[PDB]
DNA sequence: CGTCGCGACTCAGCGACTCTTAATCGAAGGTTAACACGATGTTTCCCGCCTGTCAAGGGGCTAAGGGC
Protein backbone atom coordinates (compact mmCIF):
# COMPACT_ATOMS: atom_id res chain seq x y z
CA UNK A 1 0.00 0.00 0.00
CA UNK A 2 2.66 2.24 0.48
CA UNK A 3 4.16 1.17 -2.79
CA UNK A 4 0.74 1.96 -3.77
CA UNK A 5 0.67 5.92 -2.57
CA UNK A 6 4.40 6.08 -3.67
CA UNK A 7 3.38 5.63 -7.12
CA UNK A 8 0.70 7.83 -6.69
CA UNK A 9 2.84 10.63 -5.18
CA UNK A 10 5.51 9.79 -8.26
CA UNK A 11 2.26 10.65 -10.24
CA UNK A 12 1.94 14.01 -8.53
CA UNK A 13 5.21 14.81 -8.62
CA UNK A 14 6.19 14.17 -12.47
CA UNK A 15 2.43 16.52 -12.98
CA UNK A 16 4.05 19.48 -11.62
CA UNK A 17 7.56 19.27 -12.06
CA UNK A 18 6.59 19.88 -15.63
CA UNK A 19 5.27 23.36 -14.16
CA UNK A 20 8.39 24.67 -11.46
CA UNK A 21 11.34 24.67 -12.82
CA UNK A 22 14.61 22.20 -11.48
CA UNK A 23 16.96 25.40 -11.79
CA UNK A 24 17.12 27.27 -8.40
CA UNK A 25 14.24 25.45 -6.95
CA UNK A 26 13.24 25.39 -3.41
CA UNK A 27 14.65 21.81 -2.00
CA UNK A 28 11.45 19.37 -1.77
CA UNK A 29 8.96 21.91 -2.95
CA UNK A 30 7.49 20.24 -5.75
CA UNK A 31 6.28 16.30 -3.45
CA UNK A 32 3.29 15.72 -2.30
CA UNK A 33 2.99 13.78 1.63
CA UNK A 34 -0.57 13.91 1.41
CA UNK A 35 -1.15 10.45 -0.15
CA UNK A 36 2.08 8.96 1.22
CA UNK A 37 0.38 9.32 4.68
CA UNK A 38 -3.47 8.66 3.55
CA UNK A 39 -2.39 5.50 2.68
CA UNK A 40 -1.18 4.51 6.16
CA UNK A 41 -3.99 5.87 7.44
CA UNK A 42 -6.74 4.03 5.40
CA UNK A 43 -5.12 1.25 5.54
CA UNK A 44 -5.12 1.55 9.87
CA UNK A 45 -8.52 3.49 9.67
CA UNK A 46 -11.18 1.25 7.70
CA UNK A 47 -8.94 -1.68 6.25
CA UNK A 48 -10.43 -5.25 6.78
CA UNK A 49 -6.83 -6.15 7.84
CA UNK A 50 -6.78 -3.71 10.49
CA UNK A 51 -10.37 -3.70 11.39
CA UNK A 52 -10.48 -4.87 14.96
C1' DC B 1 -27.09 -39.12 -63.49
C1' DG B 2 -23.57 -36.73 -59.82
C1' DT B 3 -22.81 -31.93 -57.63
C1' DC B 4 -23.38 -27.51 -56.14
C1' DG B 5 -26.52 -22.60 -56.14
C1' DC B 6 -29.03 -21.61 -52.66
C1' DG B 7 -31.64 -21.91 -48.27
C1' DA B 8 -32.88 -23.21 -42.96
C1' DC B 9 -31.38 -25.70 -38.89
C1' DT B 10 -30.62 -26.41 -34.24
C1' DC B 11 -26.24 -26.44 -31.73
C1' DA B 12 -22.66 -24.20 -29.60
C1' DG B 13 -21.08 -19.55 -27.79
C1' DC B 14 -21.39 -15.10 -25.20
C1' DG B 15 -23.68 -11.90 -21.38
C1' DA B 16 -26.00 -12.42 -16.13
C1' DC B 17 -29.12 -12.31 -9.73
C1' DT B 18 -28.23 -14.45 -4.68
C1' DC B 19 -25.43 -15.73 -0.62
C1' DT B 20 -30.17 -18.14 5.57
C1' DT B 21 -32.31 -16.29 10.01
C1' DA B 22 -31.19 -12.46 15.16
C1' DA B 23 -26.88 -11.08 16.78
C1' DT B 24 -20.34 -9.17 18.74
C1' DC B 25 -18.65 -1.97 18.62
C1' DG B 26 -18.53 3.84 16.10
C1' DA B 27 -16.40 6.89 13.71
C1' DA B 28 -13.62 6.33 9.38
C1' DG B 29 -8.35 9.18 4.15
C1' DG B 30 -6.76 12.28 -0.41
C1' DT B 31 -6.70 17.26 -4.57
C1' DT B 32 -3.48 22.25 -3.89
C1' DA B 33 -2.33 29.16 -10.98
C1' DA B 34 -3.83 34.57 -9.18
C1' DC B 35 -7.19 39.28 -9.25
C1' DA B 36 -11.24 42.55 -9.89
C1' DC B 37 -15.56 45.18 -9.72
C1' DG B 38 -20.41 44.32 -9.04
C1' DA B 39 -24.80 42.28 -7.38
C1' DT B 40 -25.92 39.68 -3.25
C1' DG B 41 -26.76 38.74 0.85
C1' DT B 42 -25.24 39.22 6.49
C1' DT B 43 -25.28 41.51 10.68
C1' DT B 44 -26.14 45.94 14.24
C1' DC B 45 -28.91 49.73 16.15
C1' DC B 46 -33.05 52.29 16.06
C1' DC B 47 -37.00 53.91 16.22
C1' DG B 48 -42.64 52.27 15.60
C1' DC B 49 -46.33 49.78 17.90
C1' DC B 50 -47.31 46.99 21.15
C1' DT B 51 -47.15 44.42 24.28
C1' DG B 52 -47.00 43.85 30.25
C1' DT B 53 -45.76 45.72 34.98
C1' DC B 54 -47.06 47.50 39.23
C1' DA B 55 -48.28 51.67 41.27
C1' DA B 56 -51.52 56.07 42.17
C1' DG B 57 -56.36 57.68 42.48
C1' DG B 58 -61.21 56.75 42.88
C1' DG B 59 -65.96 54.50 43.37
C1' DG B 60 -69.22 50.66 43.99
C1' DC B 61 -70.39 46.50 46.25
C1' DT B 62 -70.21 43.66 50.03
C1' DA B 63 -70.31 43.06 54.74
C1' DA B 64 -69.77 43.85 59.85
C1' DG B 65 -70.74 46.60 64.04
C1' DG B 66 -73.68 49.76 66.77
C1' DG B 67 -78.12 51.94 68.10
C1' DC B 68 -83.33 52.14 68.74
Partial sequence: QYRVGLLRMERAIKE????????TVMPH???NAKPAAAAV????????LSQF
Fill in 16 to 23: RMSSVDID
Fill in 29 to 31: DLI
Fill in 41 to 48: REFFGSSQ
